[PDB]
Design a protein around this ligand. Structure first.
Ligand code: CLF
Ligand code: CLF
Ligand SMILES: [Ca+2]
Ligand SMILES: [Ca+2]
Lengths: 522, 477, 522, 477
């Protein structure tokens, strides 16, 4: 039943007595359900160290991964170029998922096409799909560039992208000079971030490899910036803002900020902004190239060093205080521009906020996950704040990255109770937050299920989630935030300290029980 | 808009395409005539998508794992292959259930074999057998396993059927191999059919020789309701208030035992014809169980459906049916009274998957609204045959619409509201057109039954009449 | 007792059994406490409509006010001028409190002096305190200007500021040319916002009243901006940013953003930034003057219109979509600058966010409080979002303001269930959120105690607080936010929708109970 | 620094001032000599503040309402006059209590008469009488009322004593008029004295003819502990573990009945001498109750105090005393072992109100720290007499320090840590000097007793050794 003046959606409709009775009768009549005491017994067992030991012996099963597949990252990379359609050669189901995944995080349209390989192409290859697909996409959607990646079907059967695109031009399906950069992007290698690196290096090679003879390092007076897989609009914006405040000439290579934030003004814009083809063609003339996320830009780095002859600096992601400082000093050195008064003051405003909030942050214990560069920057800033990053999980991490994070943890006393995990998933992390409980988790929306599980053991065992990373689907407009630079560090700090104070308020809200500590001022 | 004007809009939109695509797309766009009974005279469907045109469709794995099997709550479904498919599909579809997640129910979890290069090169059958043993250790209350094949499985020659048979015997467990690789078929649709055949072959006959279930003359199954936002629970309640006993729900909030008990019922009640007609036909042929189609969107259709169902049973069920209708009458009449005056005359375009593009029309009409265009991602002609009488004369029909087509049709027709999916939502809001998600219910619902109608009306009103839609134009230009 | 490796502060130390038993013995032995059942009975009564009717009959008693006194606002106004010392003639206790109050909100130093009138001055007046105080302050703190206000003692005894300052200069305590603007600021008239108005008008008159002969309206091609009492740093910054993006010449009159945000770089800066004395002297040569917060700038308006002959436009505070549009259109008209593409795009990004989040906002009911301009801007934006502002409280509001807000409510169907209250306090509001329960409160930190009270009735009665306004003492760094313009509306929208979603996640976190609706995607 | 360098520092700082201020300030600044017993030979105190110099001091209303009366939990305290004073002082001071706020306890609420112009011109006594009736109606479980006068009350000639007598008799309620107008005296101090006299005159004698209280030989009161962060509770626990009966706490977590029962005790235990010596002397003269000073900051002082107190009783309490000391010994020793090596040799400057500037020195020394400078906002020479022995030779002392002086002293002495209040915190953090709030405990505590010492040590360490302090200089300059 419903009362028209106060209509109930699923919650709380199904708590009405009639629904509750109906759902009990379903269970008892037909579901053959395990008894509640057995459910409770098994739940308890899943919180123990014994279960954790079995969980960490897995070799074949993954549960609740914290990574996605390569072509997702290739699509994100492609979206950052002017009037560019991402095109994924292979099976169309994939593109439905890539589009929906990004639609839910950004709350924006995401344009991408498939060439719809089916069982017929599985065995004779997808050449005809390429030919008709390229022609159809060009005519219908009018891109100025089509950036091609692959689904796993196309990888397994061995379709030769280069050959297929070359034949499409030879036979007239798309013009000879129409840009069709490509990259092989197998989902069974690496993760989404590897797809971004593969796509970017393919676009870079397309525009520069055959034209190197007239290039002269430093002749355009700019610094190239390669952002990597980046899903916070404020990260593209802060980098551009800081360079501009310094008077540094720059080219952001892969810039999706406009196309991921078009206005609602009565028209749909399939394309907006982006890195121009002229900027990619001219990029070897830069002073140097800076990689913002070097732990997933290794293929790109080899091309930029080997072909463009740029001496890529060894810089960590510009997250937290020390690594933002190092970024700015290196940019100053390469460009000859001094760090301006504005940025020096912004740095000191961050330091002031650290002094203001250090008493609540000190000693707080965190579990965290995400992509390698993001995770190491988060760990670095937590140590700077006097926090303990106890459980550090990077599903898509590697051995060399783990050694580097373990070295950061050694340079601080706040690293002493921390462990770094690679190859491990969110079912692994769930055990860690039961057996070695931290104060909070810092992660993406999939962490909500871990908070749910911890609460079920009891309120005193609940580990609240702080949403930083990708994807964030259950809050709105967090994709507009910043994590890089002093601005990002201010936003992160504010979020962490206010999470702590929110939880303390909840725990002290009980009248004549805990409200002696329900202070007005904190 | 006149029939001639709609026909001219179709030809105008088609002008953009190369010849091959033009000729094909023409066959998938039509102007409705409600007199036609054979829809193939007017439109074709269930054909391959043209490359490069931005279809909205998914794959057979979405149809099998995401739609049919994933909702079954007390089984563990393995996304078998590389990591992407299971991650993108994790908890995207709101197929609601009651359970203790990670303990006795597993629906919003993502289990995968996360294939790496070595698994591609040398095969994944050894990894699959080891994975099964890991699942048994760590999730002891699971009541069976499905293996949902992603694209590489069949391309590399793996034998998941042999693994399922050997491990299933070893562990005395139901292990179901599903060959739903996404390259198969042309859309989600073949994944439904594959999934239905897998239920038939591995689960449905398990109790064929058992006589212990105590039956009644009023036993039914709800076939093809995935419990989106609780839709199946707001349907079930009505059936049981009418005196029926709902033995099974396929597959929203569904359990493996319910599926196994379904051959014991007297009547199969089919909501989603597209996804479950196959198993319903099987059950008629093998067990002699009749099936019938129904519609619980909005009061007119729900009342008609209740009466049609009750007519299959005795006078006692018919009397209870009239009691149910009398109970809910003031409720839905109050909804109409409040919301119809706010919505009367407003025009809607729909684009959805295989059922809702026709099924929801009556509920819009119950609020005085007009559905001016409708279409489907993956329907077959038997679906179009059921649509032509539901749509008005001279309305627009579109099968596997392209992103370009849908945008251009909307620009000309200028509907007051659009009902489609997540890949369409944010496009049409930018254009200033109210949009409602008609897959996920925009995180609302249920929409089925009398309780769902209230929610549906509230939602259509909140969005269509929202103050935001008057603000897109800056007052200075 | 304490365990050295996990030391407990008050919470949760006092929950240890031995402390709980001690506290029980204290109560039973010595406190002669009302029985718990009587406490419960009385608490329940305080939640009723019967109690609300008695509460609303108060004529003499105020409980938990939502306003402060004039000199607080005079001090904040004075801090916005270059190298200016706020100086409060009267009793020193007042200054300790003003400084502390601001310290806790901004987490910054707040400089202000008193002249320490004591019982001697109580009868004979504070002339000597003024002479020595001005001399001492100038020598020790080296301000370029001293801006003088009053405490209530000085006002009651009738000290003549003008005469006292003039005698200090006549007798040589401070130079004749040293600027000492002043205002009488009685705490028993108006509120803190009135003190801001009085101080500002005193400063404007000091620098312009006797120099009008050479002034020509419009000759400097700028627009003056008067902000009023403003305690979000982002509000000063967004107005400057928007005007600069439009190419509008402007003078912000009272600009404390620098002195309220100095860096932690190893030195204390007593003064930073601020409106210059030259800017105030030149202000009558502007095209016009725009008041951001007109409902507390009435004295200032009379002076600007009567003396400077500016035709001050009738504009609401620039909060929400329509009032930000109206502000920009009027600034365009006055300046002759068109609204640029940047700002048009930013508006459309706000509208996009409104379209994205409307389903969760629709119909949500709010109680809210604060100063008049802020409250009416919040009300207007809530109506634009499809929300219901049910209980609107402005302790310091007047009848003309109330009529204006009632007219805004009458122009939207979302205003049908709303009531505006003036002269009422947070103990009145407490009753309203019990008898006509909203979904949330929007207010300052004093609202925490109402949330506490509502939870005590039960979880289903709890009304969560969303902190927007002044003071905010129990979270860190919220003073850095923005409430004005499109940027402020985006911040407010994000905060409101995510408060709704956070609460819904709390209510759906119960395993096998409410977690059927614990959706990943919202 | 050496003696000569500290003396030259003082003279250098004083050069900024006009002559009259210079002559006065010189009298309030000194280099400690622990061989001096009469502090007036070295420093003066409890004088008016010089105008315009940015004293840190508050007023008599802060001393009466904020400090003494405000904490009493079951009374309603009226801030009588205009709206400011009660608002700035609402819930600023962390005088903790157990109760049901708004029902039987009222500490964090702000009750005011909110004077307007008509109340100034024609008087507030009629308003006050009506206010009292409204209180009685809306807060029926209050156990009495106090009237805390703000500046205007005595300036306009109101007669709150007549209202309090007339209404108190009418309602059979204790109504306490307090003439703590902020213009009186020179600081918070006179407000303490005014408040103590008001307790004497209107509350303390209420039970003088009542013999029903069953007294014991072990009954004490804690006098002058305002329970900041729970400090009085972490003191009380020890006293009661020692076998004493703590009949009253003045005034943290205090009730009106415990105040009324205080003249029945055997010994008054005075923590805050400055604020409550007055009433302690009164109770000795009138009731014959002895009083003694004690110190519960850090283990050395806490142990000395427990032994001194137990010596006033019998062998059974002395035995319990040694049991308490033995119980807590491994706990405090574990704190010292952890934190003293992290803090040894670090130098601290303090600036606080009337007690803590000398009282906390032992606790710092228990962590190997040195107090190199101290001073008080509002102490009298009897406080400085008790300070000179506690501080080292050639350390700096400052009474009613100006903002300018404090900054310049810190720039030259370069302490490792400063302990002061909210108006000081943010200045010194910018300078890169670790700062702890020594009024509010920076929202931590308790600091009293053995349990408090663990929190104190953790807090000084966290701040002094924090990573943030090495980051203030940009690496490029
Ligand atoms: S049609 Fe999967 S998302 Fe793809 S590239 Fe392979 S891992 Fe990544 Fe359907 S079954 Fe899946 S979703 Fe596509 S791959 Fe095929
Ligand atoms: S010494 Fe009060 S804050 Fe003042 S201007 Fe009057 S309302 Fe405002 Fe002490 S008692 Fe109070 S705090 Fe001052 S006024 Fe006097
Ligand atoms: Ca959007
Ligand atoms: Ca600060």
């Amino acid at each position: 039943s419903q009362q028209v003046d106060k209509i109930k959606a699923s919650y709380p409709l199904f708590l009405d007595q009639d629904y509750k009775d109906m759902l009990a009768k379903k269970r008892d009549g037909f579901e053959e359900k395990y008894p509640q005491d057995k459910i409770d017994e098994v739940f308890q067992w899943t919180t123990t160290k014994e279960y954790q030991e079995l969980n960490f012996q897995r070799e074949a099963l993954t549960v609740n991964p914290a990574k996605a597949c390569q072509p997702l990252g290739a699509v994100l990379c492609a979206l950052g170029f002017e009037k560019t359609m991402p095109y994924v050669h292979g099976s169309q189901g994939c593109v439905a998922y890539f589009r929906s995944y990004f639609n839910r995080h950004f709350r924006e349209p995401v344009s991408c096409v498939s060439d719809s390989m089916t069982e017929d192409a599985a065995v004779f290859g997808g050449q005809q799909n390429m030919k008709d697909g390229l022609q159809n996409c060009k005519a219908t959607y009018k891109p100025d560039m089509i950036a091609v990646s692959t689904t796993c079907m196309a990888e397994v059967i061995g379709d030769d992208l280069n050959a297929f695109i070359n034949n499409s031009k030879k036979e007239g399906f798309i013009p000879d000079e129409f840009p069709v950069p490509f990259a092989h992007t197998p989902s069974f290698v690496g993760s989404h971030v590897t797809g971004w690196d593969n796509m970017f290096e393919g676009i870079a090679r397309y525009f520069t490899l055959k034209s190197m003879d007239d290039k002269v390092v430093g002749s355009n007076k700019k610094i190239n910036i390669v952002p990597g897989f980046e899903t916070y609009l404020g990260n593209f914006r802060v980098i551009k803002r800081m360079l501009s405040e310094m008077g540094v000439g720059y080219s952001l290579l892969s810039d999706p900020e406009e196309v991921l934030d078009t206005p609602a003004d009565g028209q749909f814009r399939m394309y907006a902004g982006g890195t121009t083809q002229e900027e990619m063609k001219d990029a070897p003339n830069a002073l140097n190239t800076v990689l913002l996320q070097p732990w997933h830009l290794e293929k790109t780095k080899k091309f930029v060093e080997g072909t463009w002859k740029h001496e890529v600096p060894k810089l960590n992601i510009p997250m937290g205080l020390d690594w933002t400082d190092e970024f700015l000093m290196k940019v100053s050195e390469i460009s000859g521009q001094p760090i301006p008064a504005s940025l020096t003051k912004e740095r000191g405003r961050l330091v002031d906020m650290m002094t203001d909030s250090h008493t609540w942050l000190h000693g707080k214990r965190f579990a965290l996950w995400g992509d390698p560069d993001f995770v190491m920057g988060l760990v670095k800033f937590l140590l700077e704040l006097g926090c303990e990053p106890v459980h550090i999980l990077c599903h898509n991490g590697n051995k060399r990255w783990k050694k580097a994070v373990d070295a950061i943890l050694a340079a601080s006393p706040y690293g002493k109770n921390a462990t770094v995990y690679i190859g491990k998933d969110l079912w692994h992390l769930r055990s860690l937050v039961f057996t070695d409980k931290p104060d909070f988790m810092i992660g993406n929306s999939y962490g909500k299920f871990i908070q749910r599980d911890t609460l079920h053991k009891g309120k005193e065992f609940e580990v609240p989630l702080i949403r930083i990373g990708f994807p964030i689907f259950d809050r709105h407009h967090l994709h507009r935030s910043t994590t890089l630079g002093y601005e990002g560090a201010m936003q992160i700090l504010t979020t962490l300290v206010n999470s702590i104070l929110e939880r303390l308020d909840e725990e002290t809200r009980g009248m004549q029980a805990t409200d002696y500590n329900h202070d007005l001022v904190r | 808009m006149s029939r001639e004007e709609v026909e001219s809009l179709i030809q105008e939109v088609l002008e953009v395409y190369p010849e091959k695509a033009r000729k094909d797309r023409n066959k998938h766009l039509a102007v409705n005539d409600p007199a036609v009974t054979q829809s193939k005279k007017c439109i074709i469907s269930n054909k391959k998508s043209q490359p490069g045109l931005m279809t909205i469709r998914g794959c057979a794995y979405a149809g099998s794992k995401g739609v049919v099997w994933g909702p079954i709550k007390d089984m563990i479904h393995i996304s078998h292959g590389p990591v992407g498919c299971g991650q993108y599909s994790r908890a995207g579809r709101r197929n609601y259930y009651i359970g203790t997640t990670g303990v006795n129910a597993f629906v919003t979890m993502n289990f995968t074999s996360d294939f790496q290069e070595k698994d591609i090169v040398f095969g994944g059958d050894k990894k699959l057998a080891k994975l099964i043993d890991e699942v048994e250790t760590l999730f002891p209350l699971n009541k069976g396993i499905s293996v949902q094949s992603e694209c590489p499985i069949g391309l590399i020659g793996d034998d998941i059927e042999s693994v399922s048979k050997v491990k299933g015997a070893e562990l005395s467990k139901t292990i179901v191999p599903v060959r739903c690789e996404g390259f198969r078929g042309v859309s989600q649709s073949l994944g439904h059919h594959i999934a239905n055949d897998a239920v038939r072959d591995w689960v449905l006959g398990k109790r064929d020789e058992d006589t212990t279930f105590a039956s009644t003359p009023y036993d039914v199954a709800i076939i093809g309701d995935y419990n989106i936002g609780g839709d199946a629970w707001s349907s079930r309640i009505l059936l049981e208030e009418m005196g029926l006993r709902c033995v099974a729900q396929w597959s929203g909030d569904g359990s493996i035992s319910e599926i196994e008990l379904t051959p014991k019922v007297k009547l199969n009640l089919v909501h989603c014809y597209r996804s479950m007609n196959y198993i319903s036909r099987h059950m008629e042929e093998k067990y002699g169980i009749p099936w019938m189609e129904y519609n619980f969107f909005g009061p007119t259709k729900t009342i008609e459906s209740l009466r049609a169902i009750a007519a299959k049973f005795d006078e006692s069920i018919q009397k209870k049916c009239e009691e149910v209708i009398a109970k809910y009458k003031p409720e839905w009449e109050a909804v109409v009274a409040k919301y119809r005056p706010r919505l009367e005359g407003k025009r809607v375009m729909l684009y959805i998957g295989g059922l809702r593009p026709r099924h929801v029309i009556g509920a819009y009409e119950d609020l005085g609204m007009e559905v001016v265009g409708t279409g489907y991602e993956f329907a077959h002609n038997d679906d179009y045959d059921r649509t032509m009488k539901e749509m008005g004369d001279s309305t627009l029909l579109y099968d596997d619409v392209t992103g370009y087509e849908f945008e251009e049709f909307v620009k000309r027709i200028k509907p007051d509201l659009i009902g489609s999916g997540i890949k369409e939502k944010f496009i049409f809001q930018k254009m200033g057109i109210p949009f409602r998600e008609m897959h996920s219910w925009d995180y609302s619902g249920p929409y089925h039954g009398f309780d769902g109608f209230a929610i549906f009306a509230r939602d259509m009103d909140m969005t269509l009449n929202n103050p935001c839609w008057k603000k897109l134009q800056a007052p200075w230009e």
